[PDB]
């Protein structure tokens, strides 16, 4: 929608230096980040979006919410591409990131890229998903790394969150073959995302 604060989780792996998309995958994610930002700003300027990375081995904030895309872009320049996203820690930090804003008039939205085969225990992430729904937080899981060679565990979490809510989670499945990641997410709902009330 609009009036929406979105946290980007960018996955940093070595499945993102692989040829999946012209050049490397990591180069595609940059264009994707900018595309998301500009959509949400153009509809309504009271939309701000920030970026956290899984760089290191414990996610670090690069940029808080901002209306300046040059800030999100400068911070992507600073990266470690040998780092490893852990999903369970990223959901918790993102929740706290959403609790750190300048005004609480904005919906809670997380858009997390997943570029690596997920190897975090299912049982824990059931519980995290059920925490989001009592905070009125939605989560939009873009899968193009788990399809490739891994069981589909993130699907079950999306169903868990679904309740009548202002913003409600979505599952977007992006093809892993070369069809231009940035074109694909642009065509998927990222501004026409509905609640479920």
């Amino acid at each position: 929608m609009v009036l929406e604060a979105t946290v980007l989780v960018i996955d940093n792996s070595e499945y993102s230096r692989n040829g999946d998309f012209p050049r490397t995958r990591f180069e595609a994610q940059i264009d994707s980040v900018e595309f998301i930002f500009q959509a949400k700003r153009n509809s309504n300027p009271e939309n701000t979006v920030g970026l956290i990375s899984g760089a290191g081995a414990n996610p670090r904030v690069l940029s808080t919410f901002t209306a300046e895309f040059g800030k999100i872009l400068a911070g992507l320049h600073d990266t470690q591409i040998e780092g490893k996203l852990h999903m369970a820690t990223a959901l918790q930090i993102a929740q706290l990131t959403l609790k750190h804003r300048q005004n609480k008039v904005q919906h809670q939205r997380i858009v997390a890229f997943v570029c690596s085969p997920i190897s975090d225990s299912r049982d824990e992430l059931i519980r995290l998903a059920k925490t989001l729904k009592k905070n009125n937080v939605a989560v939009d899981i873009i899968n193009f790394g788990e399809i490739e060679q891994n069981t589909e565990l993130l699907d079950e979490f999306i169903a868990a969150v679904n309740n009548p809510q202002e913003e409600t989670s979505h599952l977007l499945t992006v093809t892993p073959g070369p069809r231009l990641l940035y074109e694909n997410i642009a065509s998927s709902p990222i501004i026409l995302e509905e609640g479920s009330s």
Binding site: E14, Y15, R17, N18, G19, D20, T24, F26, E27, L76, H77, D78, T79, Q80, I81
Partner: protein, 192 residues
């Protein structure tokens, strides 16, 4: 392509080692290059005493230098030249890759935004010194080791692989000279 060079290795090796090579190729077609790094490590553990190890690596430098991980290549290079009984050849390979990073990181650091090529440079320098120690030019090896040590301590945080290789050349030098004392302390760092 690469199949035709790879096939010659497939013939010489054991029939039980033949399926391994097929897997390397399978990953390359898919363009999964992390999977290919994993698959290459396997052959080197139980066959680096083969000359098939050397051949395999040579081809892979040519067709993979930004595709599989940068570290993996250089680490393979250390192993490769212990298997080469040639020292003139050893000097050539080392210098080709060292030159190749120099131009490469001018493009590569800005476009990705991050990957450091000075990590490979150290692993390479350690191998040069190692070669002079196998050649038994002990004056040349030593003075390259003094220069290298000053450089290592400048870098703030040292990956264990880099400093493991440094401590190997020091071990080799001291036991040629038969200084029992100098050997002993360097080797406690090497085992740690």
């Amino acid at each position: 392509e690469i199949d035709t060079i790879l096939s010659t290795l497939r013939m010489e090796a054991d029939p039980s080692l033949h399926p391994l090579f097929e897997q390397f190729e399978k990953f390359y077609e898919e363009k999964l290059w992390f999977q290919l790094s994993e698959s290459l490590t396997k052959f080197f553990d139980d066959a680096k005493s083969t000359p098939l190890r050397l051949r395999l690596y040579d081809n892979f430098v040519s067709k993979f230098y930004d595709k599989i991980n940068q570290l993996s290549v250089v680490k393979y290079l250390l192993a490769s030249l212990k298997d080469s009984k040639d020292f003139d050849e050893s000097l050539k390979y080392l210098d080709d890759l060292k030159a190749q990073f120099q131009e490469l990181d001018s493009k590569k650091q800005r476009n990705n935004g991050s990957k450091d090529h000075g990590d490979g440079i150290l692993l390479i320098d350690s191998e040069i010194a190692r070669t002079y120690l196998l050649k038994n030019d002990l004056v040349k090896a030593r003075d390259l080791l003094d220069d290298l040590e000053k450089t290592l301590d400048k870098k703030d945080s040292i990956p264990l692989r880099i400093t493991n290789s440094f401590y190997s050349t020091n071990s080799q030098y001291f036991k040629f000279k038969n200084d029992f004392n100098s050997f002993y302390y360097t080797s406690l760092l090497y085992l740690s």
